[PDB]
Design a protein around this ligand. Structure first.
Ligand SMILES: O=C(c1ccc(C(O)(O)C(F)(F)F)s1)N1CCn2c(-c3ccccc3)cnc2C1
Ligand SMILES: [K+]
Ligand SMILES: [K+]
Ligand SMILES: [Zn+2]
Length: 361
């Protein structure tokens, strides 16, 4: 059926008392959303597929079985094996959407991938699943234009690295930055790409700390002023999302700190669905509060299926973005007005609420 796809595999589970992916899968079952989707069969990525992004030595070290107590080193060996499986699960879903076998999809996968660099694992990431999917779309299907949006609260340093000189992949990261003082320390607004890729790396970097925390109004405004204008101009053929949910309320000060609602991610998904004819796949990255990530996963899948979304509260729709967010947005727009026509014509309305922007448009 031409509908929303899912990928999940119990071989990614730590114990071989529900973790993140098992809790997300259960929510999708209980809500009936799983029943409306096509769950596909995953597989291991090949060593060759992993090597579109990573070095041979890196792939051989972490991608090969050496031949489980979760408190022993063999937990990490298993996590690296789980990563190899996660990459193949994401690749399979991405290809089924990109070929039109399925409409769109959500990959319920772990570990996350977006921090893993060419020959360096880090931040719980061994292999960059989303980047590998994107490399294979280019190499195997000659996809002309790919948008990667990364809305995990931490900068996707691996994904930025993988495509930094490539103008055929637009990488857009929304993340807490605070002038270099938040993990992993990369993703300054000034980082715009290199070579022919100049202008095709967009760091929507929030600065100013938690005075106050960023919330729905701030992210909605960032989508309005930076993400959607730039993404629309680019006009991608396929959209991939590194969908971390650690920006949702309930994630404390270093491993989070923002107070987005799960409902807001549904709306952010629906916005991205207006691009690439609806050819969009989300892949789980970070987030750890089980209620928050299950709520968020539910909102996103519901949106992908075309279900009517729970309205955002009137308060959120009427809220002007906080001063630090406005400053952050305006710095990014200023930098990227050099490369994008949608940022050259105008004056900033980043300080308007959604309703005000709508009224005044
Ligand atoms: O911020 C992270 C994250 C790494 C990866 C993160 C992610 O982006 O959410 C991912 F990969 F899961 F998606 S978030 N850190 C910094 C703090 N930290 C810690 C802490 C240790 C002591 C006190 C506070 C945090 C352990 N491990 C980490 C890695
Ligand atoms: K990000
Ligand atoms: K790029
Ligand atoms: Zn994160």
């Amino acid at each position: 059926r031409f509908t929303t796809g899912l990928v999940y595999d119990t071989l990614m589970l730590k114990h071989q008392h529900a973790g993140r992916i098992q809790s997300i899968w259960s929510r999708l079952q209980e809500t009936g959303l799983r029943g409306k989707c096509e769950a596909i069969r995953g597989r291991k990525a090949t060593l060759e597929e992993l090597q579109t992004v990573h070095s041979e030595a890196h792939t051989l070290l972490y991608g090969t079985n050496p031949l489980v107590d979760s408190d022993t080193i063999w937990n990490e060996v298993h996590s690296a094996g789980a990563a190899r499986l996660a990459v193949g699960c994401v690749v399979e879903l991405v290809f089924k959407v990109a070929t039109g076998e399925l409409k769109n999809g959500f990959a319920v996968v772990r570990p996350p991938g977006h921090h893993a660099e060419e020959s360096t694992p880090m931040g719980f990431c061994y292999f960059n699943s989303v980047a590998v999917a994107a490399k294979l779309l280019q190499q195997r299907l000659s996809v002309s234009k790919i948008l990667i949006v990364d809305w995990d609260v931490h900068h996707g340093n691996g994904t930025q690295q993988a495509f930094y000189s490539d103008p055929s992949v637009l990488y857009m990261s929304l993340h807490r930055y605070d002038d270099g003082n938040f993990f992993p320390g990369s993703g300054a607004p000034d980082e715009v790409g290199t070579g022919p890729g100049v202008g095709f790396n967009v760091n929507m970097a929030f600065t100013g700390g938690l005075d106050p925390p960023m919330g729905d109004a701030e992210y909605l405004a960032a989508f309005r002023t930076v993400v959607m204008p730039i993404a629309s101009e680019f006009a991608p053929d396929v959209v991939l999302v590194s969908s971390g949910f650690d920006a949702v309320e309930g994630h404390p000060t270093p491993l989070g700190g923002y107070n987005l609602s799960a409902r807001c991610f549904g709306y952010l998904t629906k916005q991205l669905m207006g691009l690439a004819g609806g050819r969009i796949v989300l892949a789980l990255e970070g987030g750890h509060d089980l209620t928050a990530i299950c709520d968020a996963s539910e909102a996103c899948v519901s949106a992908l299926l075309g279900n009517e979304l729970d309205p955002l509260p009137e308060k959120v729709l009427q809220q002007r973005p906080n001063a630090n967010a406005v400053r952050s947005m305006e710095k990014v727009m200023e930098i990227h007005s050099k490369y994008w026509r949608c940022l050259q014509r105008t004056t900033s309305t980043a300080g308007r609420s959604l309703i005000e922007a709508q009224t005044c448009e």
